[PDB]
Amino acid sequence: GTIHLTRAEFLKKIADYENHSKEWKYLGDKPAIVDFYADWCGPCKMVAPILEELSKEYAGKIYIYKVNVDKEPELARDFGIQSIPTIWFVPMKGEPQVNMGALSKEQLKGYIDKVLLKQ
Amino acid sequence: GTIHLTRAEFLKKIADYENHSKEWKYLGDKPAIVDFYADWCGPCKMVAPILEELSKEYAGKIYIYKVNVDKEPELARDFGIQSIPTIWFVPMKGEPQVNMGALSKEQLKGYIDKVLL
Ligand SMILES: [Zn+2]
Ligand SMILES: [Zn+2]
């Protein structure tokens, strides 16, 4: 005849349907920096050229990404950006490490070496 | 040098971070009907015998399930049930086809032979 179904049975016979929160999973082929900045940020203008030269010095070893929070408000909001700049250090495996505020080249190199490249 | 990212590009190069994938993965070994009913439901009274009949003539081809929404409030709420009866036709692959309202034996056979089989 027809088959009566509890929710517990539904999960086994129909679909294990709950939309469980997704675990962080990096998709890039090299570790990365992700720099959340804005045009009106003072420090960022000094940091900007530092990131360009770091992207050359570590070329082939890392990516350095930039996100303009004004142009990408959904992304910025979803990641709770408050301090400008907010800099993410994203290793191939593990949770991103987050720094709020500006950093010197040597501070950046420190994070690149220890966090991105696992020295 | 540095690479600028749109959100769409972030989703590909960094992390597909939203809970927006989940694939509907039907777990059964044959197609199914799932009938969301309730005791307070008038038209369900007419549909019930029809389903039990269909349950027999298609035995081994499909399953016909029944969910009492008042006994399974989380299921009813999670799937946004808005009227009773609500009937699902669940294919081996693809999203289920959903019909709100009582159907006829002629109509149910329609979906079964065409959508399920
Ligand atoms: Zn979002
Ligand atoms: Zn739920």
State the resolution, in angstroms: 2.0
Tell me which DSSP letter residue B11 carries: H
In angstroms, the CA B90 to CA A36 distance is 44
Query: Does A16 show up as a binding residue in the annotation?
Result: no
Domains in chain B: ranges and CATH: 28-116 (3.40.30.10)
Instruction: Evaluate whether B74 touches B114 at the Cβ level (below 8 Å).
Output: no
Experimental method: X-ray
The distance of B4 to chain A (nearest Cα, Å) reads 5
In angstroms, the CA B41 to CA B24 distance is 28
Instruction: List beta partners, residue B63.
Output: B32
The distance of A119 to chain B (nearest Cα, Å) reads 22
B14 with A34: Cβ contact below 8 A: yes
Is residue A41 among the annotated active site residues? yes
Q: What are the strands, taking DSSP E only, across chain B?
A: 3-4, 32-37, 63-68, 86-90, 97-100
In angstroms, the CA A62 to CA B3 distance is 11
